[PDB]
């Protein structure tokens, strides 16, 4: 869903865990589905980390 994460370290860690074979299917699907939320009307942003 064209998601974003809060730091380059976070992105790299997510890539590593997504690729590794010992990850839970739930964790993999969550790393794939996790989304940020940018509310300009309220001047707020939430990012996964």
């Amino acid at each position: 869903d064209a998601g974003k994460v809060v730091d380059s370290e976070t992105a790299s860690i997510c890539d590593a865990i997504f690729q590794d074979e010992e990850t839970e299917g739930a964790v993999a699907r969550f790393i794939a589905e996790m989304r940020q939320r940018v509310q300009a009307d309220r001047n707020v942003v939430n990012y996964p980390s």
């Binding site: 839970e24 299917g25 739930a26 699907r29």
Partner: protein, 397 residues
């Protein structure tokens, strides 16, 4: 409690939806939930039983996950899943039985079994799934202090009570006025009788009242009110008040007069039905008040006149009656009805495993005694045991 319910629910969904030939998309989310349950449970030891004759059993979890790839599930997949599901079902069964067989005076709402106390830990919260059953919904609502509600068909709200009251009496018991009643389950049958047929009463009318206070408030109750009590319409030989002797009762039934049924809450007349029979509704009430009268007929044909003399010998005794059934109702507290099997399940487990009489429930889970003294502690323990029993019934037939 919610964790135990969620284990039962995910196991039921696994035994139902995980079937041969089903699409992977039908069970993707269910398999996610199933693997969550397995991962959470693995590495834990549980101990169940040890009370009465319920055996002590130990449960150890090291199971493999389910890897769904086949486009349509095949026999191998179903067999592998059933291996895990059977063990988990046995575990849930034992946990539910061990929780049902226990009780406490203080903190009766909280888990009593050590297995359920352990399942209350924070780490098992990951299995919660969805709380859709009526009892679990009401459990959560009560825990948050929201107005709950249980819908009962023929609620067992009246403690069994078959009795009589003589307002006029004498040792001969040959000239009596009074009332007789049976309160049982969801039925009230009352009958006022007068041997003189109100010949000497003021206005040739005898008044009768029957007040029944319910141990809990019932709401949106559908009631059937019929104008005669069949249970007190035949000859009887009844023991005296003190059991010294017996007296003979030979009724002849007249229509009840000036019938008024009042459903009251906090001493206020919430509903009042005057001379109306059939199906009525009581929206909210904690006490029922039946009022009726025996009116001596002002005109009598010779056959009727022969029955009601003015001298002492009263071979036939005038009687009026009312029957009142609560076909359905709603109660905030847990009750026993004629449709649910939760009381039967709890009592059956206790009887089968010979659980010693505890400090809260009466011996044998006697419903009459329980409802006669339905204390708050008894209500808490009963709600807990009923909720876990309904959890158990999702997997045990």
């Amino acid at each position: 409690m919610d964790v135990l319910y969620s284990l039962s629910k995910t196991l039921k969904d696994a035994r139902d939806k995980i079937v041969e030939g089903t699409l992977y998309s039908n069970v993707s989310d269910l398999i996610q939930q199933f693997n969550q349950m397995i991962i959470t449970m693995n590495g834990n030891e549980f101990q169940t039983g040890g009370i009465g004759n319920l055996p002590i059993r130990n449960w150890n979890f090291n199971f493999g996950l389910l890897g769904t790839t086949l486009l349509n599930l095949d026999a191998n997949y179903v067999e592998t899943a059933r291996n895990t599901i059977d063990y988990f079902v046995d575990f849930v069964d034992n946990v539910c039985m061990d929780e049902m067989v226990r009780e406490s005076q203080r903190n009766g709402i909280a888990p009593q079994s050590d297995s359920l106390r352990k399942l209350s830990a924070i780490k098992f919260k990951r299995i919660n799934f969805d709380n859709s059953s009526e009892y679990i919904e009401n459990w959560n609502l009560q825990n948050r202090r929201q107005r709950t509600g249980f819908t009962f068909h023929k609620p067992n709200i009246f403690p069994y009570s078959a009795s009589f009251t003589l307002n006029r009496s004498q040792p001969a018991h040959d000239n009596l006025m009074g009332t007789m009643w049976l309160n049982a389950g969801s039925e009230i049958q009352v009958a006022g009788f007068d041997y003189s047929c109100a010949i000497n009463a003021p206005a040739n009318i005898q008044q009768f009242e029957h007040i029944v206070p319910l141990r809990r408030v019932l709401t949106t109750a559908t009631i059937t009110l019929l104008p005669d009590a069949e249970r007190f319409s035949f000859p009887r030989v009844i023991n005296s008040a003190d059991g010294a002797t017996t007296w003979f009762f030979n009724p002849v039934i007249l229509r009840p007069n000036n019938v008024e049924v009042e459903f009251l809450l906090n001493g206020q007349i919430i509903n009042t039905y005057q001379a109306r029979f059939g199906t009525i509704v009581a929206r909210n009430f904690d006490t029922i008040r039946l009022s009726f009268q025996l009116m001596r007929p002002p005109n009598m044909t010779p056959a009727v006149a022969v029955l009601f003399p003015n001298a002492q010998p009263f071979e036939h005794h005038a009687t009026v009656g009312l029957t009142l059934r609560i076909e359905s109702a709603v109660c905030e507290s847990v009750l026993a009805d004629a449709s649910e099997t939760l009381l039967a399940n709890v009592t059956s487990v206790r009887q089968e495993y010979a659980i010693p009489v505890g400090p809260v429930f009466p011996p044998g889970m006697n419903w009459t005694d329980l409802i006669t003294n339905y204390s708050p502690s008894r209500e808490d323990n009963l709600q807990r045991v009923f909720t876990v029993a309904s959890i158990r019934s999702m997997l045990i037939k």
